[PDB]
Amino acid sequence: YKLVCYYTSWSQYREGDGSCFPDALDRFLCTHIIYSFANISNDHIDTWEWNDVTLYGMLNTLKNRNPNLKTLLSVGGWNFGSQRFSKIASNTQSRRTFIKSVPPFLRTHGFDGLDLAWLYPGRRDKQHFTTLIKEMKAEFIKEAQPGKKQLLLSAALSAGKVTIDSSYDIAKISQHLDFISIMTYDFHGAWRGTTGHHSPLFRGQEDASPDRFSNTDYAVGYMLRLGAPASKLVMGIPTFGRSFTLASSETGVGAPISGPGIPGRFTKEAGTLAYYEICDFLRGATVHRILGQQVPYATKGNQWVGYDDQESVKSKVQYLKDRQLAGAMVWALDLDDFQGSFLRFPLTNAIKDALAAT
Ligand SMILES: *[C@@H]1O[C@H](CO)[C@@H](O[C@@H]2O[C@H](CO)[C@@H](O)[C@H](O)[C@H]2NC(C)=O)[C@H](O)[C@H]1NC(C)=O
Ligand SMILES: COCCN(CCc1ccc(Br)cc1)C1CCN(c2nccs2)CC1
Ligand SMILES: [Br-]
Ligand SMILES: [Br-]
Numbered sequence: 001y002k003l004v005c006y007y008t009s010w011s012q013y014r015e016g017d018g019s020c021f022p023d024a025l026d027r028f029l030c031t032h033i034i035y036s037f038a039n040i041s042n043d044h045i046d047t048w049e050w051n052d053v054t055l056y057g058m059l060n061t062l063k064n065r066n067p068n069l070k071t072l073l074s075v076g077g078w079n080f081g082s083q084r085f086s087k088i089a090s091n092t093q094s095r096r097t098f099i100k101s102v103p104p105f106l107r108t109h110g111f112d113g114l115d116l117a118w119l120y121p122g123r124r125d126k127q128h129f130t131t132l133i134k135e136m137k138a139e140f141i142k143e144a145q146p147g148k149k150q151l152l153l154s155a156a157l158s159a160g161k162v163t164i165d166s167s168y169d170i171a172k173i174s175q176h177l178d179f180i181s182i183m184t185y186d187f188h189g190a191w192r193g194t195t196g197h198h199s200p201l202f203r204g205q206e207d208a209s210p211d212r213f214s215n216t217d218y219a220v221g222y223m224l225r226l227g228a229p230a231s232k233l234v235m236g237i238p239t240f241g242r243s244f245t246l247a248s249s250e251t252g253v254g255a256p257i258s259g260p261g262i263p264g265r266f267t268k269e270a271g272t273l274a275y276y277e278i279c280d281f282l283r284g285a286t287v288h289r290i291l292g293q294q295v296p297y298a299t300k301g302n303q304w305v306g307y308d309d310q311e312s313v314k315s316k317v318q319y320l321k322d323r324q325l326a327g328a329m330v331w332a333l334d335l336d337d338f339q340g341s342f343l344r345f346p347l348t349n350a351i352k353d354a355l356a357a358t
Contacts, residue, residue, distance in 0.1 A: 001355045002327030004154075004181055004234050005030035005348060006074070007059065009037070009049045011334035017341055018266030018274075020334035022055055027062035029348055030330070032070045034115045034154070035059055037077040040084050043094040044101035045075060045114075053109065060110035072152060073106060076117035085118045089128035099135055103143040106151060113152025113178065114140075120158060121167040130169045137176040152178045156329075159184045159219035159236070164226070171227030178232070181329040182223055185238040189214030195255045197295050197306035198242035201316055204292025208254055215293070216316065220323060235320045236329040239275045239336040239347045241307025251299040253290055261303055267335075274335040278307050279342035310350040317354035328355065 011020040025033065035056065039048040047053060056073075063069045076085060088094045102114055114136065121129040137153050144150040155177050158164055174180065190196020191210045200215045212218055220235060243261025250256065260271030264281075267274050273281065278298065285300035294315045297306040308316070317328055328351050330336070336347045343349065 001321075002032060002179065002234055003030040003348075003352055003355060004032040004034060004179070004327065004329040006034050006036050006330065006332040008332050008334055009035065009052065009055055011332075012049070012051075012055070014266050014334075016266070017339050020338055022058035022062070024338050025059070025062060025333055026345060027066040027069055029345055029352060030333075031068065031327070032072060033059060033062070033333070034072045034074045035111070036074040036115075036332075037080070037117065038073050038075045040075060040081075040088055040098060043088055043091075043097035045073075045098065045105045056109045056111070070112040070152065071110070072113040072115045072154060073109070073111045074115035074117050074156070076119060076156075078119050080119075082119070086121070086125050086128070089118075089121070089125055089132040095132060095135065099132075099139045102136065103139060103151060112149075113154060115181075116153075116155040118155075120163050123166045126167055126169055129167070130172050133173045133176050154179050154181060156181045156183055156236075157223070158182075159187065159216070159223075161213040161219070161222060164219075164222065170223060174228045174232060179234050179326055180223070180228055180232055181234045181236055182219060183331075184216040184219050184236045185240075185331070186242075187214040187216075191254065193256055195244050195246070195253060195257055195297075195304050195306070196242075197253070197290055197293055197297060199238050199306070199308060200290065200293035200295050201312070201319060202293055204290055205253075217319070220320075220325070224323075230324045231326055233323075233325040234327050234329040235316065235323075235325050236331060237313050237316050237347075237351060238308055238331055239333075240331070241273045241275070241278050241305040243271055243273055243303065243305040246299070246302045246304050251286075251304065252288070253293075253297070255304065257304070261305060273305055273307070275307065275347055276335075276337040276339075276341055278305060279337060281305065308347065310346060313347055313351050314354040317351055321355075321357060
């Protein structure tokens with residue numbers, strides 16, 4: 001089984017024990033660690049943070065004692081230009097420039113592959129996205145024909161049915177990618193103005209859910225139905241939770257809200273909490289496991305957060321193995337309890353143990 005784990009460079013700037021650098025990562029925890037994110041500048045792949053070369057080194061050092069560990073560099077994100085990615089994929093000139101720039105950059109900085117995290121191609125760039133993936137794979141094939149270990153090509157794909165329908169040609173890009181990480185979190189499941197778990201495993205109670213596609217099971221089944229081999233499918237599991245400010249004494253799935261939850265001390269973003277922030281939050285809170293959805297939420301005062309814990313990620317790993325998928329993907333290592341402030345990496349270690357069947 002694959003255990004694909006993301007590291008985010010901006011996590012270095014977090015205060016106190018939130019500060020996360022690649023040397024805090026257990027070199028044996030994951031089979032693949034993906035560094036997020038790299039830039040596209042002048043139609044070339046390039047660094048993003050000022051100390052990216054150094055952090056690259058800290059990350060790829062981890063393979064010294066661990067030769068099986070593979071690393072990829074992720075390009076894209078949600079604070080990208082996105083028009084830039086479309087320009088590179090649509091403009092043939094920019095496309096050849098980017099594709100040619102990638103293998104030497106990766107070899108120079110010690111990465112074993114590239115990860116595409118374009119969010120999102122859209123209706124206009126579905127075909128350009130397919131072309132980009134095909135020609136990227138072709139250049140990787142050419143670069144290593146003289147008996148070199150071939151560069152890997154992966155892609156993080158949305159788990160949202162609408163985005164999947166408008167953005168991806170699944171059966172075509174699946175034959176070129178080494179694996180597909182399906183982002184089975186950030187689901188916009190709940191009715192508007194209402195609490196909902198952002199990463200439920202199953203639909204759960206039928207009349208308590210606005211639609212059928214806003215759950216992990218549906219997204220995995222759909223991507224399989226569209227022609228993605230199970231052996232190339234890596235199911236994403238979040239080490240973060242989605243939070244809401246309650247508007248009433250109702251604390252269940254479906255309760256009214258006035259907006260996003262209060263930002264955590266370390267990540268400082270309304271509506272989201274890192275898992276260690278959630279561990280701090282759990283002191284004094286009540287945890288209810290959503291019966292049909294197999295994931296927990298925790299409530300305290302006017303605060304509601306749907307998250308994943310050790311039991312729920314064990315359940316999700318059992319799901320992916322029953323489906324015979326390639327493994328699990330984790331977003332993100334720096335959002336797990338990496339310093340063990342509440343052992344270390346509790347959620348990712350739970351995923352890793354659960355991946356070891358029986
Ligand atoms: C990522 O790449 C983009 C594209 O080259 C950079 O955008 C330019 O940044 C310079 C410096 O601030 C500006 O003067 C230009 O006007 C920008 N051009 C465009 C088209 O956006 C961006 O700075 C890069 N980011 C990082 C962190 O390296
Ligand atoms: C409002 O946030 C929406 C963006 N979501 C969540 C970001 C977030 C997490 C924790 C905190 Br605390 C604050 C923000 C990301 C999640 C993972 N991501 C990818 N996974 C694989 C490749 S790209 C897609 C977008
Ligand atoms: Br419909
Ligand atoms: Br359907």
